[PDB]
């Protein structure tokens, strides 16, 4: 009578139990479709891949991320991901076990409605139930109060908490995620004289980026330094056997994450809409969040982003207000270690959303409870 | 073709 | 010659003549600053735009208020727009003639020092003065005493006025205005699903909310006929074609008005903040104070606030007690009015601060003409 | 103190002097070198071929385009075009002669590094500049505002612009003009008998298609009109005497260019790159643009593409937004016009880029001075 | 882009 | 916020 958990950010989703402490199941959230017609026959070809067989093989389809910013458009796509995560990466039934899922702050209440009718129609759930990254990946670190910052493929965003108590008005969004971040790269590659412009080919740009962008401290300082000498150069091999240099473009990114104007985006920083958040919060609470502020996602993965982000709140903000980034090395599956200890929680069992309540009130409860 | 990796 | 009266307001700037019953100009208070490097060279002069230009266009561009809350933050940006009123709008030199200006109470009397110190220097005008716009509003409604609740673009305020004599500590304010209104705006429409997070579009639910939001009687059954109707519910045409829709939020921002708990902020409404006021002061004065409250400002334009806020007092109030709400429809130019007739009128001639006197004692003497 | 335009075109090249309307000296740009070895001695043989040459003769010469989808990979053909564009057609010493250049928005900053440093040494120039064929295209109408779709012969892209400002994060470029059509051309005509491998065939090709074929409004019901009644099979001349027909693949050229999947792209049409740069943008420019979006290039001189170009935007773009497409006579030749009018203009002049600026911070002063 | 009206 | 300190 155990429980489980999955996460269905747009990068990637991530299924596992509860009982556990590490998630079991991973893979990236495309839906393959052929282009071409096919002759040769006996194969199998299927109509519609989904998981690491589009990954192993996607040159010869298109590629869809049916989420996008956090949004679905594909439900039909969204329900095959589901029944390829709930029964082939691991063989269990919906029925038997109650699910867990996690959204994004300020998602459409429409979305939620018809995430949870699905889940109840299709799969027949007995309960469910939707939460908030951010207090997931504090439930995780283990901590109560302080403000998270969290940035995945979809979107990014930051949410104070103090004892558990939300603040609405001190939430901020963004969505400068690695999408974007992707396909300025690939513009700044073509500058280069390197072309990507398909599907497969911004799977491989967001890997060489995940494998090689770093962000650095003086941007200005980094850019004279490659301008000037070469020692920053690196070299990155491709399927095809030939190879690429990188030069400045690996820091330009995460700089282009940090100043919006770089990729033609009206809006603020990551540390600027940080500072403003937490401004908007309460003078005896300033203190507590400043040194209890906690980093999660996979965007944030980059190294060096720490030291960055503290240099520059610490310079934004006075002094006398000592502060302490928590960015634990695990941070990508924190929030799913937050969802697995939340479900095997005693209290929270009571705040399941059954599904003879559902038949009766309707999917409104998911945004009138939660 | 002509862009030292792809095309 | 003549007099002129130009009130800066957080959103709008009113200047014009004296003795007159509508202004000239009434144009927005913004700078428009490109964010685009610009690569023709036949039009590409004027980097930074003033005036209703940067309404036309206001999309390459970004807008910054020069006033928030009412206090002002750049004094270029207003040098700025007072020279544009001046040349531009009026075509009037000002050291012809002097000019009346505008400040909300408790503002600090370091920023009134800073504007008539900067007003007597670049200009070089003749006499100015500064006023508050509660009491030119009621000037201007006629009204022989009772209280005032002005609430312009960023701040909002009640303030009353009896026997020929204010009251310093009977004043009360709030930071509360369409600013936060169109904020909290924009937030309830990224959870229906639409999205407006740069300047211009700022702007442009500004519009919508000007043009089509009302306010209710009863929040709770109207939200409750609202979701269950769909009649009440009205779309409207964004410039390029797109439509949206609009069926709960229109009446639930005049309740985040009157309810600051959904802001966030743990305040007073402004119902409680009237009754207050009027407790500070004697109930012999309180009696007919309660048949004279006048309205003024554009927050307060929303078609059935008085309904609402006579209900809401009354229900707070003893009936004992005849009570009265009054607001005519002109609620927006009634302080240029009230500053038109102070301007006309020759007692207050005596009052204007001249030449003469700042550059023999300086700015500070204004701490005692108020 | 005259100036010199030369737009080197992937296909064709056209250099003149500037103040003129029209172009002086238009010529394909390809090189022919001799294939059979060992000639008839004593009435002698040249080397390799050049302009117009080539093409009156190239039974014997095989021939080579040095540009591709407009970047360089010839530099000794690209300088032997050059010079013989500068001295035989024109027959004018460039060392007192500021020329002008052109480029696609997109391409090898090292390919644009290395052209200028071409023509600052081996030519000994006063000055020169380069530019976007989209801003001249725009500068030949004179409009400032709106969008402009180019298509040349290797090359096209589309370019978005508002009163000076261009959106560099909404510039979209594709490698689909006139040459992977010349093949798809070759392909269905052996599909129907006819074979054209070589590079004299290349230029039949070529030829046919700026002759006969035609876009088409109706796909479908073309091609089934055309398969039913054989009304639209047209015949042509070959230069020994011979004469084919040809039918449906005027339609399925266009076609092919609208449908890159026929060519085995999963890259959309020309209409819904356009709709999503113009996405990106602003809604108020989105607007503007929706009015005047204009069409230049060799390739846009399809008898019908306007019209068909406009039905598509418009089914798939909303209602209520006028798009009034425009694409005037003379258009392949609006790149030169454009450029004329700039080195006309006395305010571009302080924009050339000198031998000095050169010679003191190397080739990458074209970057800074763009 | 997917918000029904504006990104 | 355009206080020097609170809101
Ligand atoms: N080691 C790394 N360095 C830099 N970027 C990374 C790294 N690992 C993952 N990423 C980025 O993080 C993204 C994954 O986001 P993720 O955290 O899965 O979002 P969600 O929380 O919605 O699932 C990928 O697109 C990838 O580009
Ligand atoms: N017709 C309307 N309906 C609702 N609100 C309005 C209307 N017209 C103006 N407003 C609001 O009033 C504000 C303008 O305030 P204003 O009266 O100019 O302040 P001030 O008196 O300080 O100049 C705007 O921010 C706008 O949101
Ligand atoms: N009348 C025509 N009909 C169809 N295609 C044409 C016509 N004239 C030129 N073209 C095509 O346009 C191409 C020339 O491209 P061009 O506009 O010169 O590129 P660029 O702008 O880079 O110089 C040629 O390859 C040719 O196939
Ligand atoms: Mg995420
Ligand atoms: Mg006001
Ligand atoms: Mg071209």
Not at chain 1, 104 to 110: E, Q, S, V
Not at chain 1, 281 to 310: E, F, H
Request: proline residues 5%.
């Amino acid at each position: 009578t155990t429980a489980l958990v999955c996460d269905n950010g747009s990068g990637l989703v991530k299924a596992g139990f509860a009982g556990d402490d590490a998630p079991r199941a991973v893979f990236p959230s495309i839906v393959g479709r052929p282009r071409h017609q096919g002759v040769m026959v006996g194969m199998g070809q299927k109509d519609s891949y989904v998981g690491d067989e589009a990954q192993s093989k996607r040159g010869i389809l298109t590629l869809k991320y049916p989420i996008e910013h956090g949004i679905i458009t594909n439900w039909d796509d969204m329900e095959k991901i589901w029944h390829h995560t709930f029964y082939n990466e691991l063989r269990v039934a919906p029925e038997e076990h109650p699910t867990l899922l996690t959204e994004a702050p300020l998602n459409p209440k429409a979305n939620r409605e018809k995430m949870t009718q699905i889940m109840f129609e299709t799969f027949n759930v007995p309960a469910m139930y939707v939460a908030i990254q951010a207090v997931l990946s504090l439930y995780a670190s283990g901590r109560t109060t302080g403000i998270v910052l969290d940035s995945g493929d979809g979107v990014t965003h930051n949410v104070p908490i103090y004892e558990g108590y939300a603040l609405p008005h001190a939430i901020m969004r963004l969505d400068l995620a690695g999408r974007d971040l992707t396909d300025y790269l690939m513009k700044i590659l073509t500058e280069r004289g390197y072309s990507f412009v398909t599907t497969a080919e911004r799977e491989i740009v967001r890997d060489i980026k995940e494998k090689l962008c770093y962000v650095a401290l003086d941007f200005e300082n980094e850019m004279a330094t490659a301008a000037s000498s070469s020692s920053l150069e690196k070299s990155y091999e491709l399927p095809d056997g030939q190879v690429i240099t990188i030069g400045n473009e690996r820091f330009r990114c995460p700089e282009t994450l940090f100043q919006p104007s770089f990729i033609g985006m009206e809006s603020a920083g990551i540390h600027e809409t940080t500072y403003n958040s937490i401004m908007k919060c309460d003078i005896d609470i300033r203190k507590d969040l400043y040194a209890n502020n906690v980093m999660s996602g996979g965007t944030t993965m980059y190294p060096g982003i720490a030291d960055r982000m503290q240099k520059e709140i610490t310079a934004l903000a006075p002094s006398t207000m000592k502060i302490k980034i928590i960015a634990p090395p695990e941070r990508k599956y924190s929030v799913w270690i937050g969802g697995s200890i939340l479900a095997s929680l005693s209290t929270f069992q009571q705040m399941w959303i059954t599904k003879q309540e559902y038949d009766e009130a309707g999917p409104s409860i998911v945004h009138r409870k939660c | 073709p002509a862009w030292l990796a792809t095309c």
